[PDB]
């Protein structure tokens, strides 16, 4: 049992990590963060910023979630991110990922008390 | 028989020293993604040197570097070493540390499986490797050199190896830019080889349609070929056409055919359907990331319904399929008694397409066991139809609906069906679907009612 806020950190938070030198970054991280258990998570984003920085996003621009929920927030500044995309050669339990890096604004859904990220919505 | 298997752990000096006596005694030692470094390779070398029972050693995904890798191979040169399977995948091996390979491969006459994937040895490192592989005492059954920074100049040395070996069963050179001429040299080496090759993987190797007559020749020459992976190569329809005659030979017993992202369209899919209808041996086929379109899908479905087709798994993720193709899959899900897995993610099916599929699956006599419908633009309005399937279907064990447009309301409709203990589904996959804490509570309540039910997110 984990809270939504804990699940978000496990799946999307890697403050000190870096993928720019490691093409196998996603392969390691998706496996380590328990996102290849039972099924290969098709796509996932890791954020390389301090946890407190990502949490501060909930106090920034309010926008609409992709599913039309209204509790989504866009980061004021572009953040360092690594995208992981499952390759079409994958067949569970073999999960091979393509690793890409960007600096882009993120959109997260915030919930509960304290008001923290519980869902990664998009990068813009 | 003694086996140790560590996956994804931070081995502290404490936890580490514990294992040394084991590494000196055990038959099987796997230390994968364990944060090992060169600081630990002398322990490994010493341990292994004194281990006459060791047959498998895997150290994949550890930052050993050239020094670390060097130390490990050094310890594997005792006349006592009995090793059969060795993996140094993703261990930071560069050309700089390959000078030891020729010596190691000469002495390790028991070695059958060698994994060097994800090491940037390059062509210079590969040549040193082949100097070892060339040694008469080096008789591998399996060689994996995926993503090792190799180019066309590595093909001649590799081909020269294949010509004189007879024990090769599996060869993977995927994700190396061998180029058209390099691939021709490799094929020639395979043709001239007496090896009864069982598996050949050359994903993303710069293979073109021009290479496909040679690959056809390769297939024809290896009646033992069970798996062929030519994914992520620009083969095109013409390439497939040049390939199919070999697949159609009576001696061909191909089991798995992987053609992910090969610039194939409808007519190329047509060529392959000829193979589906004639080769009962073909059990797994991937055409993911090819623009087959609805016409392509129509052809597959008609072939799947032919008596000659016994396909078990079909991978067609990201194939530009729309709701218009779904009536044809319905006939398949209803009639085909061989298809157990159907991956249709990342196709713009919509609620319409998925509702159609639900019509066929809402019968209790289907055989489909796994269905992926992720990123198919499924909304809340398609979930009630899926809910009905979960009630009425008696074969579906896994359903993937990740990355769709649905939300809590949709998900709640699915959970309601799963409340029934008679439901056949064992695993529901819902990655990147956002629902509120309220739905989660209903979700975790169900999980505790039915512990055998796996809901993945």
From Swiss-Prot, chain A:
Residues binding substrate, per UniProt: 7, 10, 41-45, 66
Disulfide bonds: 26-84, 40-95, 58-110, 65-72
Active-site positions on this chain: 12, 119
Cell compartment(s), UniProt: Secreted
Listed GO MF terms: lyase activity; nucleic acid binding; ribonuclease A activity
Tissue-wise expression: Pancreas.
Domain of life per record: Eukaryota
Protein task: Endonuclease that catalyzes the cleavage of RNA on the 3' side of pyrimidine nucleotides. Acts on single-stranded and double-stranded RNA.
Protein name in UniProt: Ribonuclease pancreatic
Organism: Mus musculus (Mouse)
Segment of the intact protein contained: 26 to 149 of 149
UniProtKB/Swiss-Prot annotation, chain B:
A GO term, aspect molecular function: ribonuclease inhibitor activity
Gene coding for it: Rnh1
Coiled coil regions in record: none
Keyword vocabulary terms for this entry: Acetylation, Cytoplasm, Leucine-rich repeat, Nucleus, Phosphoprotein, Repeat
Protein name per Swiss-Prot or TrEMBL: Ribonuclease inhibitor
Stated role: Ribonuclease inhibitor which inhibits RNASE1, RNASE2 and angiogenin (ANG). May play a role in redox homeostasis. Required to inhibit the cytotoxic tRNA ribonuclease activity of ANG in the cytoplasm in absence of stress. Relocates to the nucleus in response to stress, relieving inhibition of ANG in the cytoplasm, and inhibiting the angiogenic activity of ANG in the nucleus.
GO cellular component entries: angiogenin-PRI complex; cytoplasm; cytosol; nucleoplasm; nucleus
Assembly information from the UniProt record: Forms high-affinity heterodimers with RNASE1, ANG and RNASE2.
Subcellular location: Cytoplasm; Nucleus
Pfam families: LRR_6, LRR_RI_capping
UniProt remark on domains: The LRR domain forms a horseshoe-shaped structure that interacts tightly with target RNases via a large protein interaction surface on its interior side.
Residues that bear N-acetylmethionine: 2
Annotated organism of origin: Mus musculus (Mouse)
Any one biological process term the GO annotation gives: tRNA stabilization
InterPro entries named among the record's database cross-references: Leu-rich_rpt, LRR_dom_sf, LRR_RI_cap, NLRP_innate_immun_reg
Residues with PTM Phosphoserine: 87
Main location class: cytoplasm
């Amino acid at each position: 049992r984990e809270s939504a806020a804990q699940k978000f950190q496990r799946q999307h938070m890697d403050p000190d990590g870096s993928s720019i030198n490691s093409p196998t970054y996603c392969n390691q991280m998706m496996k380590r963060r328990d996102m290849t258990n039972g099924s290969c998570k098709p796509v996932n984003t890791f954020v390389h910023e301090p946890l407190a920085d990502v949490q501060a996003v909930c106090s920034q621009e309010n926008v609409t979630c992709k599913n039309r929920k209204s509790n989504c927030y866009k980061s004021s500044s572009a953040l360092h991110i690594t995208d992981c995309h499952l390759k079409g050669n994958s067949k569970y339990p073999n999960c091979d990922y393509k690793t890409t890096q960007y600096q882009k604004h993120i959109i997260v859904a915030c919930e509960g008390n304290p008001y923290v990220p519980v869902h990664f919505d998009a990068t813009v | 028989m003694m086996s140790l298997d560590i996956q994804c752990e931070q081995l502290s000096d404490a936890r580490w020293t514990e294992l040394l006596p084991l590494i000196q005694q055990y038959e099987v030692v796997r230390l994968d993604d364990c944060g090992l470094t060169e600081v630990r390779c002398k322990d490994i070398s010493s341990a292994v040197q004194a281990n006459p029972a060791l047959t498998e050693l895997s150290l994949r995904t550890n930052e050993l570097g050239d020094g670390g890798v060097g130390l490990v191979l050094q310890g594997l040169q005792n006349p006592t070493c009995k090793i059969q399977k060795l993996s140094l995948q993703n261990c930071g091996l560069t050309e700089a540390g390959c000078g030891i390979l020729p010596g190691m491969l000469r002495s390790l006459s028991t070695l059958r499986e060698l994994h060097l994937n994800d090491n940037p040895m390059g062509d210079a490192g590969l040549k040193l490797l082949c100097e070892g592989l060339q040694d008469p005492q080096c008789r591998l059954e399996k060689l994996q050199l995926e993503y090792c920074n190799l180019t066309a100049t590595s093909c001649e040395p590799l081909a020269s190896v294949l010509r004189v070996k007879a024990d090769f069963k599996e060869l993977v050179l995927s994700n190396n830019d061998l180029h058209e001429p390099g691939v021709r040299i490799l094929c020639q080496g395979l043709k001239d080889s007496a090896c009864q090759l069982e598996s050949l993987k050359l994903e993303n190797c710069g293979i073109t349609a021009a290479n496909c007559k040679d690959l056809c020749d390769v297939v024809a020459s290896k009646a033992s070929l069970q798996e062929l992976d030519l994914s992520s190569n620009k083969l095109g329809n013409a390439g497939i056409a040049a390939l199919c005659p070999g697949l159609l030979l009576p001696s061909c017993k191909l089991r798995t055919l992987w053609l992910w992202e090969c610039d194939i369209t409808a007519e190329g899919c047509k060529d392959l359907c000829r193979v589906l209808r004639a080769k009962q041996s073909l059990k797994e086929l991937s055409l993911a990331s090819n623009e087959l379109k609805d016409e392509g899908a129509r052809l597959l479905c008609e072939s799947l319904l032919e008596p000659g087709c016994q396909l078990e798994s079909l991978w067609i993720k990201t194939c530009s399929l729309t709701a218009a193709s779904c009536p044809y899959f319905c006939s398949v899900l209803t009639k085909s008694r061989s298809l157990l897995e159907l991956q249709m993610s990342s196709n713009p099916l919509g609620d319409e397409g998925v509702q159609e599929l639900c019509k066929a699956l809402s019968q209790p006599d289907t055989v489909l066991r796994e269905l992926w419908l992720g990123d198919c633009d499924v909304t809340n309005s398609g979930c009630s139809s899926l809910a009905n399937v979960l009630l009425a279907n008696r074969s579906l064990r896994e359903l993937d609906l990740s990355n769709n447009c649905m939300g809590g309301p949709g998900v709640l409709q699915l959970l309601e069906s799963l409340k029934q203990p008679s439901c056949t589904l064992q695993q529901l996959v819902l990655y990147d679907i956002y629902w509120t804490n309220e739905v989660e509570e209903q979700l975790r309540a169900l999980e505790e009612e039915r512990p055998s039910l796996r809901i993945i997110s």
